[PDB]
mmCIF file of C-alpha atoms in Angstrom:
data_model
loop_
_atom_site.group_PDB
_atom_site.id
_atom_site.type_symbol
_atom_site.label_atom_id
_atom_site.label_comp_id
_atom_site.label_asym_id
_atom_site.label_seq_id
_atom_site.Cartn_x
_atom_site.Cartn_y
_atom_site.Cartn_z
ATOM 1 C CA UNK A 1402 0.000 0.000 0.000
ATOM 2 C CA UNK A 1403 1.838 3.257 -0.943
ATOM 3 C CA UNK A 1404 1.050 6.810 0.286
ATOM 4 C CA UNK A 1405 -1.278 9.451 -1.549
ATOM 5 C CA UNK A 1406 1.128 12.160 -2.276
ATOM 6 C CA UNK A 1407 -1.825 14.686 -1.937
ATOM 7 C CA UNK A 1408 -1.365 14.342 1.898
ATOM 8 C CA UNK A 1409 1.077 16.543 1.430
ATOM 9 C CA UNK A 1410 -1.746 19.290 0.143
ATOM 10 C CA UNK A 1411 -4.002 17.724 2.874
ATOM 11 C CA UNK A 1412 -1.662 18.601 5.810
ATOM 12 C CA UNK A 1413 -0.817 22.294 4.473
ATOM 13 C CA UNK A 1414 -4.841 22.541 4.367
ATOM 14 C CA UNK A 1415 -5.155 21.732 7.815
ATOM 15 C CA UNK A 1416 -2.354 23.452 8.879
ATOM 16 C CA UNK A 1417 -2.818 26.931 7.590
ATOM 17 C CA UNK A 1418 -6.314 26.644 6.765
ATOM 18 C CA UNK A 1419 -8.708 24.685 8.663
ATOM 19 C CA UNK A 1420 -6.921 25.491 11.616
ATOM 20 C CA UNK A 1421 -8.986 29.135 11.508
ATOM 21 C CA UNK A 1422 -12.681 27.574 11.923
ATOM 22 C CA UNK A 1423 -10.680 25.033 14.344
ATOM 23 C CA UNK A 1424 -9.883 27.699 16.766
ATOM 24 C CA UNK A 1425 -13.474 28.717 16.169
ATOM 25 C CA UNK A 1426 -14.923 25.793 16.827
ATOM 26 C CA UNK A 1427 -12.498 25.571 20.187
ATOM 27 C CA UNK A 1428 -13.932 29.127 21.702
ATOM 28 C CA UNK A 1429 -17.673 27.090 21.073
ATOM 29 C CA UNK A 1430 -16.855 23.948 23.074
ATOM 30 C CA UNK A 1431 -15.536 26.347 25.712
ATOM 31 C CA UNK A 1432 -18.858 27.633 25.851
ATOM 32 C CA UNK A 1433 -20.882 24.886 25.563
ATOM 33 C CA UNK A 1434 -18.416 23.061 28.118
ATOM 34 C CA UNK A 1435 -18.756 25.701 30.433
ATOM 35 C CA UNK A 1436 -19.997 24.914 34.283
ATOM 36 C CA UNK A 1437 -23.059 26.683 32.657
ATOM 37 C CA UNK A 1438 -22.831 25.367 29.681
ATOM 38 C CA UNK A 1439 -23.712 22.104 30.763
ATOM 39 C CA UNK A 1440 -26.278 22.631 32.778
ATOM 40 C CA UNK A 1441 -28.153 24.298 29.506
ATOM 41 C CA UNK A 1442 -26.746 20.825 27.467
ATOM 42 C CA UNK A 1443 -25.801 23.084 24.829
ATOM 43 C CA UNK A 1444 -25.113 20.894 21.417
ATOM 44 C CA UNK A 1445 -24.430 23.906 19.140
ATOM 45 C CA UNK A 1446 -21.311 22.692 16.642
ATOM 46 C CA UNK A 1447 -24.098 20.685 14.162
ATOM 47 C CA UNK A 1448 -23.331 22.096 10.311
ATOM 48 C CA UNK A 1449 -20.666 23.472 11.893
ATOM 49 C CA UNK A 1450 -18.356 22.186 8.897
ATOM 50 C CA UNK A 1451 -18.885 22.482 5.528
ATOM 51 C CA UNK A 1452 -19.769 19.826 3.514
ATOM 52 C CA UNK A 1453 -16.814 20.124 1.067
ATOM 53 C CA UNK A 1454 -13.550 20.348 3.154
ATOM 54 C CA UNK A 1455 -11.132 22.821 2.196
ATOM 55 C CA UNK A 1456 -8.732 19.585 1.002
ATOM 56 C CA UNK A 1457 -11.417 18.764 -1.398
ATOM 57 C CA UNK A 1458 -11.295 22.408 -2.974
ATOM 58 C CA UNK A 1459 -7.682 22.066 -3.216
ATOM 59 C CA UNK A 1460 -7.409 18.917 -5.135
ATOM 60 C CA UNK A 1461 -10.653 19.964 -7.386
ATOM 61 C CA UNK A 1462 -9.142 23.324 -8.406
ATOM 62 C CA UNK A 1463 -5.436 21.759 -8.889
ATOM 63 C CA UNK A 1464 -7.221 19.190 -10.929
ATOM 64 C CA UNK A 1465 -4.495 16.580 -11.951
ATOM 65 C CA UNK A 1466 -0.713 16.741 -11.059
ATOM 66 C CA UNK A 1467 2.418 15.542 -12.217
ATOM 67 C CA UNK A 1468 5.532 13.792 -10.055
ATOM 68 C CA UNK A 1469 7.386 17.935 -11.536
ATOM 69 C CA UNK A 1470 4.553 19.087 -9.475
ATOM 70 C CA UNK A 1471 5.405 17.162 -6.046
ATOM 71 C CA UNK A 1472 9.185 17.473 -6.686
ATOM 72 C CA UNK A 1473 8.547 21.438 -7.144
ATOM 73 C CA UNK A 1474 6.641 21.207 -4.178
ATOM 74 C CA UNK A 1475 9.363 19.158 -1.961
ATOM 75 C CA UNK A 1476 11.901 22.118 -2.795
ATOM 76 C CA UNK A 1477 9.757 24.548 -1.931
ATOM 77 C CA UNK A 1478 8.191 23.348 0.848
ATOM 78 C CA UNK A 1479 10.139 25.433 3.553
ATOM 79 C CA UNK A 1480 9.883 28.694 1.727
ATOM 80 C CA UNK A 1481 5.971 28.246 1.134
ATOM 81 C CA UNK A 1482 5.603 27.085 4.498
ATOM 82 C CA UNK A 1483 6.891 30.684 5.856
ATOM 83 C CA UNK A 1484 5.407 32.419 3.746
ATOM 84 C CA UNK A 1485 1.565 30.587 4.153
ATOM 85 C CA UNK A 1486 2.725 31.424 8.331
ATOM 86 C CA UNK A 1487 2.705 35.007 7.834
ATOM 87 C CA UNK A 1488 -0.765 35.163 5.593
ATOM 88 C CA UNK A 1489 -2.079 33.131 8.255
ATOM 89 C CA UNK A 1490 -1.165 35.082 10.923
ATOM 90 C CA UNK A 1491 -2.231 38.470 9.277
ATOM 91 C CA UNK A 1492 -5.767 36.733 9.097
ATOM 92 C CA UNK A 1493 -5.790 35.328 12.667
ATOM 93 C CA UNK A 1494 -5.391 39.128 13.490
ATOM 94 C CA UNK A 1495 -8.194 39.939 11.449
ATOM 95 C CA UNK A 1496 -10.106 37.287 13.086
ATOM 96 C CA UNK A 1497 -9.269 38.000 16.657
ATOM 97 C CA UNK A 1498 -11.762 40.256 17.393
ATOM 98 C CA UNK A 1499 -14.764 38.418 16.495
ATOM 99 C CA UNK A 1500 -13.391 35.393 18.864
ATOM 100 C CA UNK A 1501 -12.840 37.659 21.558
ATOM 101 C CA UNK A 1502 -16.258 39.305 20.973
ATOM 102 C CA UNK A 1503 -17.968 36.000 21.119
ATOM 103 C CA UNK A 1504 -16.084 34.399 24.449
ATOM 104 C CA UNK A 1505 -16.971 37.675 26.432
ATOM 105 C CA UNK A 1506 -20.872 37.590 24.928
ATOM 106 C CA UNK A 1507 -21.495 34.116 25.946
ATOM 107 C CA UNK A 1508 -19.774 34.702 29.707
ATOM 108 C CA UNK A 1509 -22.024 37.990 29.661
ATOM 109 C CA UNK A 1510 -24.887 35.502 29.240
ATOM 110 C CA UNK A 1511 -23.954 32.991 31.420
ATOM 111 C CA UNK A 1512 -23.621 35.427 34.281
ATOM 112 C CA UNK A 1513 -26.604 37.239 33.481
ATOM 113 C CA UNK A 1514 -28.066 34.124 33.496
ATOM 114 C CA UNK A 1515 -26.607 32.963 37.016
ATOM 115 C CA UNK A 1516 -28.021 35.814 38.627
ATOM 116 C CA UNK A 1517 -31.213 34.665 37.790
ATOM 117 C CA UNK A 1518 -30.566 31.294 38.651
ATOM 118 C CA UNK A 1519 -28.280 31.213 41.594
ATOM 119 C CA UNK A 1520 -30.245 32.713 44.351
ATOM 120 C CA UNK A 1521 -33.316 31.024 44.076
ATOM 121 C CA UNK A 1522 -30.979 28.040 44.181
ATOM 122 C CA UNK A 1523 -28.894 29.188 47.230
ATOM 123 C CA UNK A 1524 -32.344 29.942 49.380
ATOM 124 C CA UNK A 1525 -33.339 26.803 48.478
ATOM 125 C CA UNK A 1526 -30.397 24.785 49.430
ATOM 126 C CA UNK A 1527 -29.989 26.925 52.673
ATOM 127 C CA UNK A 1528 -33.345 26.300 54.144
ATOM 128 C CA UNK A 1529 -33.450 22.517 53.131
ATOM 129 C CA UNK A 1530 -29.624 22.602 55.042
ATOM 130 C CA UNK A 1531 -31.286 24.467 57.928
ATOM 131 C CA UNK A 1532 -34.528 22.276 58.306
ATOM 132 C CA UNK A 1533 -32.571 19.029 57.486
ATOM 133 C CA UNK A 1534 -29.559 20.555 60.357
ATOM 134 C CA UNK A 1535 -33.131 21.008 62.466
ATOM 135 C CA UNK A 1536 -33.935 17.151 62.202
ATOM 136 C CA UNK A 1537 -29.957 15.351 62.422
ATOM 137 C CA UNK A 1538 -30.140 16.465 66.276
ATOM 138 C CA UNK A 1539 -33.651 15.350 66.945
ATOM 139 C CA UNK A 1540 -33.194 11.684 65.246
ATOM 140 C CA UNK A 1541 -29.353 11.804 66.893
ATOM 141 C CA UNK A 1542 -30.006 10.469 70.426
ATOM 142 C CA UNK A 1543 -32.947 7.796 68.642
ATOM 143 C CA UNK A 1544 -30.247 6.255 67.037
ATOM 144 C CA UNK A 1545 -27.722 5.861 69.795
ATOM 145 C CA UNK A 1546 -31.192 4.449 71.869
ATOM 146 C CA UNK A 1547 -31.552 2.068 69.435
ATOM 147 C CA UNK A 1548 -27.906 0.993 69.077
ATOM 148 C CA UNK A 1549 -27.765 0.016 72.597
ATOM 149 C CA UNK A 1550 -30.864 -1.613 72.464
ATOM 150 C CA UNK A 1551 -29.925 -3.507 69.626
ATOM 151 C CA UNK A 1552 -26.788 -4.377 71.474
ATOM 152 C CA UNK A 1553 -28.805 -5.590 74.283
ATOM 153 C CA UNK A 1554 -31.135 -7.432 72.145
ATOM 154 C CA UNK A 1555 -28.314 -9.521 70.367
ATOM 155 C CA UNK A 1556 -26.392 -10.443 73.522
ATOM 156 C CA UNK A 1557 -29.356 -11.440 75.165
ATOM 157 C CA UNK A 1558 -30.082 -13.823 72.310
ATOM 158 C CA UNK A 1559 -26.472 -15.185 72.334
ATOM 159 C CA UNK A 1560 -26.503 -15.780 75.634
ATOM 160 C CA UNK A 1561 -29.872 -17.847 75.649
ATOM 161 C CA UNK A 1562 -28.373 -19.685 72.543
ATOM 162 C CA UNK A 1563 -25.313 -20.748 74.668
ATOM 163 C CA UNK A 1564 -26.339 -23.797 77.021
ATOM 164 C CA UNK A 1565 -28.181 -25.250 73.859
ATOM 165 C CA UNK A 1566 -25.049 -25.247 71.568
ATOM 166 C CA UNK A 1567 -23.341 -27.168 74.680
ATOM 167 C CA UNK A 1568 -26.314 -29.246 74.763
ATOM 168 C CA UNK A 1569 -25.537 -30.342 71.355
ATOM 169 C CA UNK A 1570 -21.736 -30.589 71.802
ATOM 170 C CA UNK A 1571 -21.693 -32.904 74.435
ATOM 171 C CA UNK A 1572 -24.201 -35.327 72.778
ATOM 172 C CA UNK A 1573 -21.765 -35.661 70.033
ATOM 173 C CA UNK A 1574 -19.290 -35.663 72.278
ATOM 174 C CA UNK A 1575 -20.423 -38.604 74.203
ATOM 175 C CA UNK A 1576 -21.792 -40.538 70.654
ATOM 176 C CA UNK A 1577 -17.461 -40.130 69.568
ATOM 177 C CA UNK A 1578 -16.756 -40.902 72.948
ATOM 178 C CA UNK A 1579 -18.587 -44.540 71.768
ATOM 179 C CA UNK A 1580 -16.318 -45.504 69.383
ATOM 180 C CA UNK A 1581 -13.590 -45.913 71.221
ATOM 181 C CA UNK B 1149 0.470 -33.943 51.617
ATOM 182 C CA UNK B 1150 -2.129 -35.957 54.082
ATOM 183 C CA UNK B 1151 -5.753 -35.314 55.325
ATOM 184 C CA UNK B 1152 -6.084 -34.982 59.079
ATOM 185 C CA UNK B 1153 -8.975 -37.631 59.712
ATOM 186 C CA UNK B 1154 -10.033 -34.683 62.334
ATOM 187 C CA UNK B 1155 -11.416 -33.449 59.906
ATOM 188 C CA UNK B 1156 -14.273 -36.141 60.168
ATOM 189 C CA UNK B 1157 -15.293 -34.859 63.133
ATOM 190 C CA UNK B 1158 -14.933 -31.366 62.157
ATOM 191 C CA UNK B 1159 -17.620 -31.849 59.588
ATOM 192 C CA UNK B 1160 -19.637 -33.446 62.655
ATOM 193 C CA UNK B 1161 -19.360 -30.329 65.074
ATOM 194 C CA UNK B 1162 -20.172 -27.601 62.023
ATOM 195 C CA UNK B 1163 -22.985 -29.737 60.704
ATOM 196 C CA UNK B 1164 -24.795 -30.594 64.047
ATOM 197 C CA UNK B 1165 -23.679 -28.118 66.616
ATOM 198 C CA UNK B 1166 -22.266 -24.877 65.171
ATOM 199 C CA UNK B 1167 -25.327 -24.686 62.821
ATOM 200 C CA UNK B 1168 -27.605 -23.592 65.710
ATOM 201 C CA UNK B 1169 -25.280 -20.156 66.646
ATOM 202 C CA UNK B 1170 -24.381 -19.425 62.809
ATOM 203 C CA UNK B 1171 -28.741 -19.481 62.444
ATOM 204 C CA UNK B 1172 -28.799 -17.496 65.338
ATOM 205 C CA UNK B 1173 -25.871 -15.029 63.599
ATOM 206 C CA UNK B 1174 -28.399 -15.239 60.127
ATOM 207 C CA UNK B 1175 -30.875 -13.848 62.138
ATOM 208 C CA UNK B 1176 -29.030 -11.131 63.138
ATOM 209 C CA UNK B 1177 -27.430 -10.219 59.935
ATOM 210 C CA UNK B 1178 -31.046 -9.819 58.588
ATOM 211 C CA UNK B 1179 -31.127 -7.090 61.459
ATOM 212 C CA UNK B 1180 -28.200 -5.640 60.577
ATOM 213 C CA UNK B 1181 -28.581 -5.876 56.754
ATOM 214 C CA UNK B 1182 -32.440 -3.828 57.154
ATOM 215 C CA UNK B 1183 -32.857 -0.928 55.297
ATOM 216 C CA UNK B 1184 -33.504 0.608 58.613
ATOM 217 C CA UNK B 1185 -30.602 -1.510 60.341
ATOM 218 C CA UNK B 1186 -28.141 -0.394 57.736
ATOM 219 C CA UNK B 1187 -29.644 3.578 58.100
ATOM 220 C CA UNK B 1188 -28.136 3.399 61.629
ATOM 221 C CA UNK B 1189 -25.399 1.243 60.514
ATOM 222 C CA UNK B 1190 -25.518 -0.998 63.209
ATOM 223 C CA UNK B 1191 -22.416 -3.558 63.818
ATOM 224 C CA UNK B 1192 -23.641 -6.083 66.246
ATOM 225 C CA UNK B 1193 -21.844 -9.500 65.712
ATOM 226 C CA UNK B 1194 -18.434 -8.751 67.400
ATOM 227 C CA UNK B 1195 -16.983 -11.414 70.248
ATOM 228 C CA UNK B 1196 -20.301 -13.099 68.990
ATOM 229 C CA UNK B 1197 -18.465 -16.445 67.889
ATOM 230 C CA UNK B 1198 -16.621 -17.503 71.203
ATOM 231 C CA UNK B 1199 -12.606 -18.154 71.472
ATOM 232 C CA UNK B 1200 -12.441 -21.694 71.241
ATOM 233 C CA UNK B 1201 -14.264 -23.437 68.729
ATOM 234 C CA UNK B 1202 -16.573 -26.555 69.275
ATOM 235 C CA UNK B 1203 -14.167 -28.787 67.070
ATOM 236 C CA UNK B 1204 -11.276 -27.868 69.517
ATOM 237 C CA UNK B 1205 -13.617 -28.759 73.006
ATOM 238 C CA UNK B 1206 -14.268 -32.538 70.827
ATOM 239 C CA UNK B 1207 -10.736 -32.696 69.901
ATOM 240 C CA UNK B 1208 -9.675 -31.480 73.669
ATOM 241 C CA UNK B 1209 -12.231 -33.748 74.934
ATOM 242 C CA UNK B 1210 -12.185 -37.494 73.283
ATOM 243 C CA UNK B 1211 -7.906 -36.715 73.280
ATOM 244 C CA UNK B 1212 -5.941 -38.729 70.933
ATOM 245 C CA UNK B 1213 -7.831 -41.551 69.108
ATOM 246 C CA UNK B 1214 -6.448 -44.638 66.882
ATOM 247 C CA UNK B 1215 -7.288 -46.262 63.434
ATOM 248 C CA UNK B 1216 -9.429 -48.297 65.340
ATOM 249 C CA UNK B 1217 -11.559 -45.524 66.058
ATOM 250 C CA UNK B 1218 -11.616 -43.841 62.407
ATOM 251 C CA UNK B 1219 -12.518 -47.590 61.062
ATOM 252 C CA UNK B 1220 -15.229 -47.588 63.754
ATOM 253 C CA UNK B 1221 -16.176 -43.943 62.963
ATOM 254 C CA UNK B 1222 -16.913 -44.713 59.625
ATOM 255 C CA UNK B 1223 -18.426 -48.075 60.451
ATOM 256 C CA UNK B 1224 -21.093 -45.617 62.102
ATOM 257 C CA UNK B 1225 -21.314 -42.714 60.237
ATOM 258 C CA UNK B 1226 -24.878 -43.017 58.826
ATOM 259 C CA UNK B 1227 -26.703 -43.990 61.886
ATOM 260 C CA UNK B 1228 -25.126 -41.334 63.833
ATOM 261 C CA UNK B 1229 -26.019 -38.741 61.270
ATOM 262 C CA UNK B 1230 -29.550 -39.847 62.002
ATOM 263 C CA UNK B 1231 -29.385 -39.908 65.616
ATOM 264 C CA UNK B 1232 -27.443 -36.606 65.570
ATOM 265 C CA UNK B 1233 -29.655 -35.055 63.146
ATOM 266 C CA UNK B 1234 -33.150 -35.892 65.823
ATOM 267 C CA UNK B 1235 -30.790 -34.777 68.857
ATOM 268 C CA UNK B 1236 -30.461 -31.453 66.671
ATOM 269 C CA UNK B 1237 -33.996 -30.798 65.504
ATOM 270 C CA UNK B 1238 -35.332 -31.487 69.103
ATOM 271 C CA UNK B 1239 -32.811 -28.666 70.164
ATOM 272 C CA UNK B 1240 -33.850 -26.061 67.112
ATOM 273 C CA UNK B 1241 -37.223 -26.473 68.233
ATOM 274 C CA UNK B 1242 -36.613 -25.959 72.012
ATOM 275 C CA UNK B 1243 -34.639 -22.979 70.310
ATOM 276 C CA UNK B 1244 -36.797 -21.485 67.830
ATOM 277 C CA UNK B 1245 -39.306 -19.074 70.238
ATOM 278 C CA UNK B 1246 -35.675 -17.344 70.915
ATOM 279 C CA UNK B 1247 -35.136 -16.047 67.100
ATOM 280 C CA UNK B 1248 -38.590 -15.768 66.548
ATOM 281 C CA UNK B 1249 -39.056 -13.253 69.548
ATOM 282 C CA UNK B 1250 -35.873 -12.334 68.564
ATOM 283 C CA UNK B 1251 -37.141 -11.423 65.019
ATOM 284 C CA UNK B 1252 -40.088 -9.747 65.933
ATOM 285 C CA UNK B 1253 -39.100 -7.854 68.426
ATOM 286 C CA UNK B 1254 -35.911 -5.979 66.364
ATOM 287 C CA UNK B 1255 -38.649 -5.271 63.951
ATOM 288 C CA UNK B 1256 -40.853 -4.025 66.245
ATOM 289 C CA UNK B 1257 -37.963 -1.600 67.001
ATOM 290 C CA UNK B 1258 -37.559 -0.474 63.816
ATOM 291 C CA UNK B 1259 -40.795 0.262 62.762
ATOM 292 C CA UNK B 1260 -41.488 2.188 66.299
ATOM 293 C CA UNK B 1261 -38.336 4.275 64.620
ATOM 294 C CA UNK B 1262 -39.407 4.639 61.482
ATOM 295 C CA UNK B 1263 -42.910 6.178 62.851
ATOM 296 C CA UNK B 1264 -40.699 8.672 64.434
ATOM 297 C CA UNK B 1265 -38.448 9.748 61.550
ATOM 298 C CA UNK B 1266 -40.163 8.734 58.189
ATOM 299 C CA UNK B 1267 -42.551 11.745 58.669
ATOM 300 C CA UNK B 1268 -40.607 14.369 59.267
ATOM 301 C CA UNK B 1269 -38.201 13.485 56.863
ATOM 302 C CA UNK B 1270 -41.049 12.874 54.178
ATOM 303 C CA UNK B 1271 -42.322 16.911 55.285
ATOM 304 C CA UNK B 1272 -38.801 17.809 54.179
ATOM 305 C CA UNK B 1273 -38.550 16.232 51.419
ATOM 306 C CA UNK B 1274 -42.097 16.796 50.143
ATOM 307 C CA UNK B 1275 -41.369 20.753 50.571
ATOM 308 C CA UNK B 1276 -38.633 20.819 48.873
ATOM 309 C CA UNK B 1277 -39.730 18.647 46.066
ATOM 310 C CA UNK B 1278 -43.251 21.546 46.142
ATOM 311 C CA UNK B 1279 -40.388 24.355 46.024
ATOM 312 C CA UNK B 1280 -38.106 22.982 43.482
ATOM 313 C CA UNK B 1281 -41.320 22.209 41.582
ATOM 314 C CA UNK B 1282 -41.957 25.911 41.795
ATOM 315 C CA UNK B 1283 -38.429 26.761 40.019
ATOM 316 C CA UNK B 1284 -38.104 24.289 37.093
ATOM 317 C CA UNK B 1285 -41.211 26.259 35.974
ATOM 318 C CA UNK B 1286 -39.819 29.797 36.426
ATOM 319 C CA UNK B 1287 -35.792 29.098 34.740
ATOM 320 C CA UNK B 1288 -37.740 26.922 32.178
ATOM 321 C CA UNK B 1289 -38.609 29.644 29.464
ATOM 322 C CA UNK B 1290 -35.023 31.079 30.930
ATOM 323 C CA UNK B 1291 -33.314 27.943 29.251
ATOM 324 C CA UNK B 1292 -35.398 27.938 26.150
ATOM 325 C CA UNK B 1293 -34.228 31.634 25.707
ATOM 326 C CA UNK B 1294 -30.342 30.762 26.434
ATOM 327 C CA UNK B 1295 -30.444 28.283 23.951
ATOM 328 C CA UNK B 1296 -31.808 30.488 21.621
ATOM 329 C CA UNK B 1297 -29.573 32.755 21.717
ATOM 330 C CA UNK B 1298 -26.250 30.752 21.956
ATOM 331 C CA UNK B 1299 -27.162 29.276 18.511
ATOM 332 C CA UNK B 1300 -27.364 32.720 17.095
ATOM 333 C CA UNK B 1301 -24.524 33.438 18.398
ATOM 334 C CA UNK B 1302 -22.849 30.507 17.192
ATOM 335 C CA UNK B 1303 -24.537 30.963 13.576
ATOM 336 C CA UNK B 1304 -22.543 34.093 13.474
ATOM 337 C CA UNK B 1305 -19.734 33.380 14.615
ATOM 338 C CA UNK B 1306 -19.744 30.430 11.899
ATOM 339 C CA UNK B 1307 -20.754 33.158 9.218
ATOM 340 C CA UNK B 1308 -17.754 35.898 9.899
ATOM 341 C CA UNK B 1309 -14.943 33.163 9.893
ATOM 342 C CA UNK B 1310 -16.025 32.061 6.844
ATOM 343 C CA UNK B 1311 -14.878 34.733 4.609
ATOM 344 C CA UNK B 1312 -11.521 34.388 6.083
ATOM 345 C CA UNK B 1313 -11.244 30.517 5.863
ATOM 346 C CA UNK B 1314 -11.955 30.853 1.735
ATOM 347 C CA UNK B 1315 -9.251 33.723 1.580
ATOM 348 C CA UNK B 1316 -6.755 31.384 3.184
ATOM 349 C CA UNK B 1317 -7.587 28.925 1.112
ATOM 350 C CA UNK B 1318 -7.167 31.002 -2.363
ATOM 351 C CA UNK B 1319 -3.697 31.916 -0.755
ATOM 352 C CA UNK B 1320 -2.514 27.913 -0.611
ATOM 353 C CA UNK B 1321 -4.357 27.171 -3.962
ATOM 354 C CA UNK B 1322 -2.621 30.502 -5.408
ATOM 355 C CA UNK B 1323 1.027 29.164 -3.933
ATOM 356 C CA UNK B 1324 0.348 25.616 -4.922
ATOM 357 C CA UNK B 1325 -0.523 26.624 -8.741
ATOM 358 C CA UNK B 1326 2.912 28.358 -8.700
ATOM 359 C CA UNK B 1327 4.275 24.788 -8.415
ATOM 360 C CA UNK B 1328 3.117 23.683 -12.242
#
């Protein structure tokens, strides 16, 4: 099995392409994977990508290549490499804003959200810990009743177990003791 | 490596003696094992079992035996089964008023608890259930509206990368075509 020498155009796709909506998509899961996010279960990357991936355009608009083509491309691979760095860089700039824009909105939103949320929560879970902190003292000394009851209860049943169990030892005992 | 022929007799004193305290132990693991036994985490069954064990008091007891005896012991072994087993089923009657009591009574104790704690702890947790229920109604339309809005968000976000995506990806195609 040899290896497609268009993964060569593949990688320099994802590298200095793709890698814009990546980022994009990573600012998204930081939402959705938010403390807040989750408790929403926000699913919000569907038709997030494109059909077509940006590879696909590539090889479609290069159409066919020859072995001059991936030989040309070999020696100029560092050179084009730089030089894709610096256009990509220039855009990420461009781009910046919008991704900064977007991870402040969405924290906006949560907290706005939050305020909404987290009192009505906090009351709630206060006054079930005060009325349940109102019932773990009046149940406390029933259960330390019942513990030494229960204590009681079980040695007293040992106890009137004992003389049978020797009951029953010594008859087997004395039935051994016969065939000698 | 040999099989001690004690070990005869060993089977005798778990099978026809020790059976009437490990029942009585049963019946106190049921106790223990409750879902109300279990709520106070009781741990009843220490020093229960005593030091010595009813196969050491026979082996103690009948002292050193010869083949004679083991020939003999299994010359006998069936019709002391029987007379053993009627020696022990006249004892776990004589026995049985004991564990029932014993049954009925823990039970009693349990339930006489329960009446004291499964109300109020019901009230507490039918409250809260009547006060959450009266805040999964009031963030409801607040989710619906979160949700709403995220995917917007998202949708643009999606929308002013893409621009910048295709002009990255007319600068590789440009590049590449200056390979041919």
């Amino acid at each position: 099995p040899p290896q497609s020498p268009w993964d060569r155009v593949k990688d320099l796709a994802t590298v200095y392409v793709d890698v814009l909506k990546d980022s994009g998509r990573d600012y998204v899961s930081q939402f959705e994977g938010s403390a807040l996010g989750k408790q929403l279960n926000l699913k919000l990357l569907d038709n997030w990508d494109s059909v077509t991936s940006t590879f696909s355009k590539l090889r479609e608009q290069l159409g066919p290549v020859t072995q001059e083509f991936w030989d040309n491309l070999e020696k100029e691979t560092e050179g084009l490499r730089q030089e894709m760095s610096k256009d990509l860089e220039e855009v990420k700039a461009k781009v910046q804003p919008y991704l900064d824009d977007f991870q402040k909105k969405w924290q906006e939103e949560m907290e706005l959200y939050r305020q909404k949320v987290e009192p009505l929560r906090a009351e709630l879970q206060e006054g079930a810990r005060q009325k349940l902190h109102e019932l773990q003292e009046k149940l406390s000394p029933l259960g330390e009743e019942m513990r030494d009851r229960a204590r009681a209860h079980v040695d007293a049943l040992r106890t009137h177990l004992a003389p049978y169990s020797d009951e029953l030892r010594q008859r087997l005992a004395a039935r051994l003791e016969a065939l000698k």
